[model samples]
Target: GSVQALFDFDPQEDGELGFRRGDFIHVMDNSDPNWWKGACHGQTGMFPRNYVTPVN
Candidate 1:
């Protein structure tokens, strides 16, 4: 069996902004066959996910 993880990010308004720098989000995936730790970090003042889509 194989497991996969997917990240859903929010869309930016005006289509002119991107993810912000230093913004980080923690993600934990505990699958039956795959366990992983992940994070989303901004590097250049880009827009964060909250600026585009809902978290829950």
Candidate 2:
């Protein structure tokens, strides 16, 4: 059997940002079959936090 996980981020009250796109972050996978054990399993993806630009 296989399992999966999901994660989401929310902005802080102070309008502070934590992570940025193209940044490298660490994640832990404790699935029964460890989804990151294949030849191409160690691949990483980026997060597009900012989609639109500010018009200031």
Candidate 3:
């Protein structure tokens, strides 16, 4: 599923994508419920799934 960020986020590491608010991205997979895989701004990593919401 596709999701988008509602606010700026500093991903804790290089393996993570630090995204700004209203960024467009994709749900990489469902490996973890709390930390979902995501790809955005040419970066891919795990982040809180709750941090995103259904694409509007």
Candidate 4:
């Protein structure tokens, strides 16, 4: 599925996923919607699920 970012998300962990300008990304996990794992910018990490919206 597709998920669009709403804010410039940075894991701030240097060990997590980072997306610029909150561009469109993909959801890697949904079992825990609160903090779901995603892949963006050639990186994969957990991001706050609420910061994005599901695409049609």
lDDT of 1 by residue, 1-56 (tens): 11121234343554322333333444333232332233444322223332322232
RMSD of each: 12.4, 13.9, 1.4, 1.7
Query: Which residues of candidate 3, in runs, are more than 4 Å off?
Result: none
Q: What is the alpha-carbon RMSD of candidate 2 to the true structure?
A: 13.9
Evaluate model 3: give its TM-score.
Answer: 0.80
From the highest TM-score down, the ranking of the candidates is 3, 4, 2, 1
In model 3, how large is the Cα lDDT of residue 40? 84
- The digit string of per-residue lDDT tens for model 4 on 1-56 reads 86888777767786567776548778878898488888877777888887888774
Question: What tens-digit string does per-residue lDDT give for candidate 3 at 6-37?
Answer: 87788777677677778876887867778878
lDDT (C-alpha, whole model) for all candidates: 0.32, 0.27, 0.77, 0.77
Candidate 1 — which pairs collide?
10-53, 18-46, 18-47, 19-46, 19-47, 20-45, 20-46, 20-47, 21-45
Model with the higher lDDT, candidate 1 or 3: 3
Model 1 spans with C-alpha error above 4 angstroms: 1-19, 29-56
Q: Estimate each model's TM-score.
A: 0.18, 0.22, 0.80, 0.79
Better of 2 and 4 by TM-score: 4
Off by over 4 Å in 4: none
Clash count in backbone of candidate 2:
0
User: What lDDT score goes with residue 10 in model 4?
Assistant: 62
Best by TM-score: 3
Residue 23 local lDDT, model 2: 29
Between prediction 1 and prediction 4, the one with superior TM-score is 4
Candidate 2 vs 3: which has more lDDT: 3
